[PDB]
Amino acid sequence: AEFKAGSAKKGATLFKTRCLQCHTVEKGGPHKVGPNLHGIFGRHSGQAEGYSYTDANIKKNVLWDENNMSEYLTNPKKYIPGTKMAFGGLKKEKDRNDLITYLKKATE
Ligand code: HEC
Numbered sequence: 001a002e003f004k005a006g007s008a009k010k011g012a013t014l015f016k017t018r019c020l021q022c023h024t025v026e027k028g029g030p031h032k033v034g035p036n037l038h039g040i041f042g043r044h045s046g047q048a049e050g051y052s053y054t055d056a057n058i059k060k061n062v063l064w065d066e067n068n069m070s071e072y073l074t075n076p077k078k079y080i081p082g083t084k085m086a087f088g089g090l091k092k093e094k095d096r097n098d099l100i101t102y103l104k105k106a107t108e
Helices: 008-018 055-060 066-074 093-106
Strands: none
Touching: 008 093, 066 093
């Protein structure tokens, strides 16, 4: 449909350079300014254990899948108005496909 599986090798590099400053993916990995993302897919928003989210991220109550993750990552503040972060989004569709292909596996 919208998301198409791409390169997880490229996705791992995009995670280091675009997400890893604020997030970790390992099971039991620490929160940074943003939550640890282990188990994020197939879970509703605002539910990383031990992380205090904004009301906006909780109230969005989105069930994370690859298509809404790609829409969100384009511009988080446009998808969840009120979310607070020094991140504008991953604008290229190729980048989002590669990152999400990696993220689906890295957060399992
Ligand atoms: C690189 C492309 C990424 C990816 C894959 C994600 N982010 Fe972030 N993010 C940050 C903060 C502070 C939050 C919490 C915001 C709030 O409470 O309003 C988030 C939230 C997310 C989510 C939602 C998780 C959920 O449980 O609903 C997801 C899927 C996510 N991020 C993925 C902070 C940042 C950054 C701060 C410098 C950067 C950079 C990123 N995020 C980048 C990414």
